[PDB]
Design a protein around this ligand. Structure first.
Ligand SMILES: Cc1cc(C)cc(Oc2cccc(-c3c(C)nnn3C3CCN(CCN(C)C)CC3)n2)c1
Ligand code: NA
Length: 126
């Protein structure tokens, strides 16, 4: 069985639009989403279909770009750091579960390189 996905809606949660969060959607997410290696990361890991009964025994804070995209589009976040953390959780989970040189790790590394290049130009909050 898969767990429920991370939440993307929560009326109780304080949230904002900031220029940094707008950059995270329009520049960061858009750049990674269109990449040829984005597809494994565009939705929660389906441990049933991938036949990974241990995945959610090991990965206790799952995250994926489909969730991040919905969070950004639904203005779920309060600040850029919350969203940056989600991207880092996604990459770290892949490295925790998999092994160096696996195809999925090479894919995550390519996306992470672009992520770092784009967040290096995150605008000053204004
Ligand atoms: C066999 C295959 C290879 C590749 C590149 C992608 C694959 O499909 C997907 C689809 C959605 C997510 C993921 C995924 C994420 C995110 N992180 N880990 N994963 C998998 C974890 C299991 N691995 C099993 C193969 N190892 C044991 C070598 C494969 C990677 N993978 C399947
Ligand atoms: Na948040």
């Amino acid at each position: 069985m898969n767990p429920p996905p991370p939440e993307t809606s929560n009326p109780n949660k304080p949230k904002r639009q900031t220029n940094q969060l707008q950059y995270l959607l329009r520049v960061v997410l858009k750049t990674l989403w269109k990449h040829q290696f984005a597809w494994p990361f565009q939705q929660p890991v389906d441990a049933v279909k991938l036949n990974l009964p241990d995945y959610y025994k090991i990965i206790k804070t799952p995250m994926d770009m489909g969730t991040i995209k919905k969070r950004l589009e639904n203005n779920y976040y309060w600040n850029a750091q919350e969203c940056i953390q989600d991207f880092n959780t996604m990459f770290t989970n892949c490295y925790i579960y998999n092994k160096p040189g696996d195809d999925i790790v090479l894919m995550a590394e390519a996306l992470e390189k672009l992520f770092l290049q784009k967040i290096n130009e995150l605008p000053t909050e204004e």
